[model samples]
Target: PRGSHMEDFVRQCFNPMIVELAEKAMKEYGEDPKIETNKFAATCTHLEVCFMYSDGGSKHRFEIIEGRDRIMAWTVVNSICNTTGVEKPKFLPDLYDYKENRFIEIGVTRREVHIYYLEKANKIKSEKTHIHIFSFTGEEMATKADYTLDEESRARIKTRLFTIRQEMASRSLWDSFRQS
Candidate 1:
């Protein structure tokens, strides 16, 4: 009964015709349709499209992380003038600095605006830090390499860090149980 219900929902909620249409669009717009799935349930694919006066493309692979969300989507793309072809990859706008690591050229245009966030835990102070990064025209974000943490925020950081670590551990346990 559960399997039949799932089948009906797939047919009704996610119509096969619409799925075909989207796939067709991906191909028509220049997205590569090649997809591969591994034994461990990983996936990799490439998509490409040539928009009006610009060519855009992305390559992505999916992996399972032990703690965080499943399906880590690592992707990169370039939006370039037609004349440039693949010579100059147009970097999307968005930059992020989590902990001390800086992430650059990370945002891409989709149906909706998307931004990347990073959270890190400082075991020494029992605190967690969050960073939000965004880009507008593909320019890199300025770095604050010499940034230092003051002692005043230590308690706040500790509270945040504990909350995040607890959540992560709970989620990881849930994932493990599900797989088992």
Candidate 2:
């Protein structure tokens, strides 16, 4: 069952160990990785994940748009590094592994790799929007953000992704497309 707030799911489900991974990454990068000091206060980091509209198009094409201080925000401007020897470090080719019912993305940084996963909002009957973002790092899992992209936003992201994919698919040589 979905909770009234996005943070609830992260607090409930994530195993204590995975939380350490997120914190470890932050700490390794010299970040405080601290939550709110006030117990009663609402605390969370937020980011918008823009993806293609599922109107019979691909779902793997998505971008994480967020403020500079937020976790994984560097993904937007920084070039992909080989800190993690994973193929296609620039973008997470597929967001959801349908066989496992999970959505995940990874960002490679100079010293650490940031991992983002969906804690809730997997069910997509009609409005496949609202999502809960989680980053693993400390004693408890961290709630990165809960963002829902509208149709207009989705369309915009889709076009950008399509353009990127086109350039990637067709390697250019001397300003001309390379055909294999």
Candidate 3:
């Protein structure tokens, strides 16, 4: 029944509506959210999540990391604002690192955030290191090079967002999601 359910779930996952959320949202929101994208499994949006790794140390390995946490990327955060149209996160924390100010005054840069995650992941020392990345957003929409993805990827991105929204709030988005 486990495999059967997973199989059926995936079939639903592949639906165009599901796929489009991932694709458009990828282009629309950029690929980074606080709670990592479960690239190998389901698509999700709402960042605060509860999770754990099998190999982590005592406190975390045996513990569940939950709640509305913050793991935003300034690059994508700013990009999403201009690219697709979005408001700043209603709950992003105000973090300041006066020491060299190696990070963004408010949100963390893509590289900095990735590094910070790796550090956290490294603490867990888990090899799976869930989730993935993307391409460069071109000129006018450019800066040396950031993110760009083809149509197929676009499909995957929005699809991820759609399902995640469904997972986040259930049936409420259906009427609106399908039209897009």
Q: lDDT, candidate 3, residue 143?
A: 14
Badly placed stretches (over 4 Å) of model 1 are 1-4, 21-80, 84-180
Q: Give lDDT tens digits, candidate 2, residues 114-179.
A: 222222222222122223332211111112442233446444543443343354344331122111
Question: What lDDT is reached at residue 114 by model 2?
Answer: 25
Question: Residue 126 lDDT in model 3?
Answer: 29
Writing each residue's lDDT as its tens digit, candidate 3 over 98-163 gives 221111111111232344344543343422223222111111111112222234533454344444
Ordering by lDDT: 3, 2, 1
**lDDT of candidates 1 onward, in order:** 0.24, 0.30, 0.30
TM-score ranking of the models: 2, 3, 1
For residues 9-38, could you state the per-residue lDDT of candidate 1 as single tens digits? 223332354434434544544653232111
For model 2, name the residue pairs that clash.
19-137, 22-136, 22-137, 23-137, 45-144
Q: What is the TM-score of each candidate against the true structure?
A: 0.18, 0.22, 0.21
Question: Native-vs-model 3 lDDT?
Answer: 0.30
Q: How far off is residue 64 in model 3, in Å?
A: 36
Task: List residue ranges in candidate 3 displaced over 4 A.
Answer: 3-7, 15-145, 150-156, 167-180
106, model 1: CA deviation in Å? Answer: 12
